[PDB]
Amino acid sequence: IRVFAIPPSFASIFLTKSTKLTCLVTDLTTYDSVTISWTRQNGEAVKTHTNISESHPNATFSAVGEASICEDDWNSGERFTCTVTHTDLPSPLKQTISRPKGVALHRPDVYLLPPAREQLNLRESATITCLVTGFSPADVFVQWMQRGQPLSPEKYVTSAPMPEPQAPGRYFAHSILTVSEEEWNTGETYTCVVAHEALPNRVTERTVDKSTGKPTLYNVSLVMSDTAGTCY
Amino acid sequence: IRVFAIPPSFASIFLTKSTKLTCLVTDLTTYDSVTISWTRQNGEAVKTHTNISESHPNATFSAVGEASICEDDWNSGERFTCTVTHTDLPSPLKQTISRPKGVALHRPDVYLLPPAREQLNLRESATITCLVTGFSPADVFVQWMQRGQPLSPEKYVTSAPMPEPQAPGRYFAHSILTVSEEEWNTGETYTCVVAHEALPNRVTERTVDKSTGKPTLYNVSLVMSDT
Amino acid sequence: DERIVLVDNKCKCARITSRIIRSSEDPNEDIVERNIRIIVPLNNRENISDPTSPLRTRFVYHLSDLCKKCDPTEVELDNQIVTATQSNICTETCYTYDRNKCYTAVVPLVYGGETKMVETALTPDACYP
Ligand SMILES: *[C@@H]1O[C@H](CO)[C@@H](O[C@@H]2O[C@H](CO)[C@@H](O)[C@H](O)[C@H]2NC(C)=O)[C@H](O)[C@H]1NC(C)=O
Ligand SMILES: *[C@@H]1O[C@H](CO)[C@@H](O)[C@H](O)[C@H]1NC(C)=O
């Protein structure tokens, strides 16, 4: 029996404006003897709603507990613990989740790399990478789009942040999206959207296509008329 | 008393160039009463270089067993077992390990991507990417090189394999290296080497330079109409 | 110090300076010089406020509509003060962005089904909110 506690994310705060706590419990044999509750440091009771999921193929059951807390409760760093009690566990399981302090704010940087030249020759698929680096803390939210249409959560993948060996305190992550070769050869556009607290407007976006980003040639035309006009 | 006999991965095999087995046993009251000796299929004794680690703060001790065997015998499907005898243990504990056979094998592909132009315009740093994808199982060992000599592992970072949502049964991984823009602008060369068990020669290399991606045509026309 | 700036456009990045060189010694044989400096962007698109617009590969620079004055000036006539129109010639396209200006956009963000449109920053840094 293992318990996973997920602290609230910045995206959930921005796009929903309601701080929530979740301590998922798995590897449960009986769902009629489970209880999920949250207790404060001083012992004040917190209202928690417990939900029961379906039956997993491995003869296990998962319980989901969603509870409403004030943004201050989490942002203050107040240490919270989720209480899980079961008849098969001689001692209740306790998990400690909190937000660390002494963290500065650093604006992240975003760059897109176009698909490799020798990948398009096979005419199978193309891969685009969105590299975001130089940020703290380590909670980011990257979403891909195609000419204003949000893309499905399944066509792109993202990686957990990892420390940067060069400069400590600044992290990085990247998102990889695949596309059809003909679709990319047509000339469609793609956008990378990242949400973080350090940004002034809190969201930034960048756009790449076939004509921009490692192109083959540059075609320019210039016209300069009325060169002998009145200036005064 | 917990006994763990993990087999070495592909990275250890390709880095130390020798097959070394481990039968480390932790949480031992007295390591003076420990004995590590592997066995082949025939059950012969194994020359084991037993090692003693430091003293854990929780009054526990561990013994490390190192044995060198010819690699040609593991892939043939021979099970190796280490026997550990302790005074507190009434009977020896045996862990039998072997190589899982029947794993699907596919050829990884290597793609190297040059640093972004916008990042170089800031004249601060440059980054390179070594994308390896379409491979199974999850055993990949990737290094970097510069003019034929290797660099410390503190200047590049690699990621663990992650399943590919598009094609079931395929994995992918990435490596990120940092380069000073000025060095990059000098004209040096960087190499990415990928070592996998499915490749015919186990080794593949890719190279990227500063001149990667330079355009071919610069069609420009100018008109001056003094109207 | 020896040059006078006439126009300092930012959208077309056009800058014109004029200078008189005292060539030789005859006052009637001094040449008048006009310098034009233009910086063209190769990555910006047709509409700088819409990332989906196609790329731009045609640039037109009319000098009659660049060195033009369009601000009423005050003139003293010894009995009153009046406002005077400098030129009678007074939708222009902005090729490049302006540092003193902020460029923003609207983008749909989906998360758990709900869609929250949020103001973005097309420019890298520019100004802060
Ligand atoms: C260039 O893009 C801008 C921004 O999309 C266009 O102007 C906007 O038009 C929409 C309605 O279509 C309004 O909601 C916005 O308020 C407008 N922007 C501003 C700043 O007023 C503009 O029309 C586009 N130009 C061309 C030629 O398509
Ligand atoms: C060069 O310009 C001409 C028109 O002046 C055009 O026909 C041609 O396609 C251009 N070259 C390239 C490589 O686009």
Swiss-Prot record, chain C:
Keywords associated with the record: Disulfide bond, Glycoprotein, Pyrrolidone carboxylic acid, Secreted, Signal
Residues annotated as glycosylated: 47
Any single Gene Ontology cellular-component annotation: extracellular region
Cell location: Secreted
Oligomer status and interactors: Part of the secretory IgA (sIgA) complex that consists of two, four or five IgA monomers, and two additional non-Ig polypeptides, namely the JCHAIN and the secretory component (the proteolytic product of PIGR). Part of the secretory IgM (sIgM) complex that consists of five IgM monomers, and two additional non-Ig polypeptides, namely the JCHAIN and the secretory component (the proteolytic product of PIGR). JCHAIN-containing IgM interacts (via CH4 domain) with FCRM (via Ig-like domain).
Function comment: Serves to link two monomer units of either IgM or IgA. In the case of IgM, the J chain-joined dimer is a nucleating unit for the IgM pentamer, and in the case of IgA it induces dimers and/or larger polymers. It also helps to bind these immunoglobulins to secretory component.
Protein name from the UniProt record: Immunoglobulin J chain
Full protein: residues contained: 25 to 158 of 159
